[PDB]
Symmetry: C3
Subunit: 214 residues, 3 copies
């Protein structure tokens, strides 16, 4: 049967033999517990822990498998559950996250499956009853898209934002609701004004049009 | 004591000796500067650069350590600073980011520590003074959650969005502020109406609108 | 020039190594790394990494793969940049994209140059002397999508629930309907003013 060769110095020339001290240094480079057994000379495979998308982990026995898992199931704290095509971060300094996500322009962020960006443009103001109200944050560096036309996403668990001239905070539904209520509250007062003014001689007020008939 | 064995051809059978040439090719496979010293035979470890979450990097000397860093401190441009449990992307094609984040449904996104999604639902319109105003983006494919009930997040540094019937842009507080101002300005105008109307007749009540 | 046969696996550090032992190391590399059973030639590993432009590349060593991961990214998570790293400085914070900084516990910074500051709550608004209370008034952190002077729009946002307890984001079509309702009411008030005047000043509301 085969016999071990003893008393072999480290090889230097390319046609020199290699000893266990040399191979062991390379197995140490793999890490993950890879090692040479001192009794049998058997080589233990490395064991690398990778993180699945369902709250579990797996161990794999070679580097390629670990890289392939990183490029499919993700890394700890950053998971996409998909087999669909890769995201594309095409714009300079853009970020694209999730299957089929596409960040097209500089500084853009695409967040979510099938989220796609278009070039951001600023909105300076709104005009209501001929009065123009100016906005904060009117020269966007780019956009964060959370979807695409017909496949938009809601954004949920958003804390109420500041309301004021300089606010660049997002606004939630409880905030628009208060505003809506105030409009109807004002309307009730207007209908009062209309009716009390009507009171006369057959005179009337029509809330449908606001017109007093007298 | 030990002597080097020379003039060894590449091994082919499992019980053949290997030479330095063969070991060096495997060593090249590690990369990161791993090598065999052509004079002493000493093996240089690989050195891999990994990215911490604090603006610094570290170097590690084996592949396992690099994978563990990737799965703890993260990768360049994608960092979570945590030791709490992993995120979970449970929905098909979902994305979950940060400790304890959970994306529960198809196409959902969970963004942030403890961010949890619930199934998305559409909102078609609002009714004000008996008139119905229809919305854009009424059929959501999923939701982006940035928190959970009682542990919500503000969203900050949001540029003003388009305001129009087809707009699916988010709005910021300066935009709602303008609208709120228009309501009070309209109210000043109405108060003037009530008062000037009273004068032609008498008193006007701003509390109820009555003349 | 000549091969040594019938070598058993080495155990002590000064023992010779055989192909079976070296083969286990190539096997640990994966990616097709191998020793040719005919010639003894070593095949490099081949690892697929994912670029930021919808392409992939193959690299021939583990260092090159780690460097790709730390530059062009991983499948489904790409930043296209050569700028400095993001920094997640707060406990349990997340920072994504070049120069992004999450400064506080539980913060998220999302995008190139996105920076957070400590979140604060907003409780209510007061309109015509009436105070309206809000939902989600005690935030545990913020998601910043930019910084002062370099804000980001947020786009393709589905319409949010409108109601007292709603913590959904609102889109522009929703504020638009509300603005329309204001001008509709104003039309009615202008009719009120004109008909009562039968001058009516629509700019001030005054009837003379
Ligand atoms: Mg896990
Ligand atoms: Mg490196
Ligand atoms: Mg960092
Ligand atoms: Mg760094
Ligand atoms: Mg907010
Ligand atoms: Mg659009
Ligand atoms: Mg990759």
């Amino acid at each position: 049967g085969p016999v071990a060769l003893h008393n072999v110095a480290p090889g230097t020339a390319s046609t020199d033999a290699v000893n266990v001290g040399q191979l062991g240094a390379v197995t140490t480079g793999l890490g993950g517990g890879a090692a040479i057994d001192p009794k049998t000379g058997a080589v233990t495979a490395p064991s690398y822990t990778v993180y699945n998308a369902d709250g579990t982990t797996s161990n794999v026995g070679n580097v390629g498998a670990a890289i392939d898992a990183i490029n499919s199931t993700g890394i700890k704290y950053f998971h996409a559950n998909s087999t669909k095509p890769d995201s594309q971060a095409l714009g300079a300094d853009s970020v694209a996250i999730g299957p089929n996500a596409v960040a097209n322009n500089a500084g853009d962020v695409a967040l979510g499956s099938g989220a796609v960006t278009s070039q951001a443009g600023g909105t300076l103001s709104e005009t209501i009853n001929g009065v123009t109200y100016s906005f904060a944050g009117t020269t966007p560096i780019g956009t964060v898209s959370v979807g695409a036309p017909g496949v938009e996403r809601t954004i949920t668990n958003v804390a109420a934002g500041r309301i004021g001239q300089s606010s660049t905070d997002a606004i939630n539904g409880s905030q628009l609701y208060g505003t809506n209520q105030s409009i109807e509250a004002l309307t009730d007062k207007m209908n009062s004004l209309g009716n009390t003014v009507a009171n006369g001689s057959g005179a009337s007020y029509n809330p449908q049009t606001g017109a007093v008939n007298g």
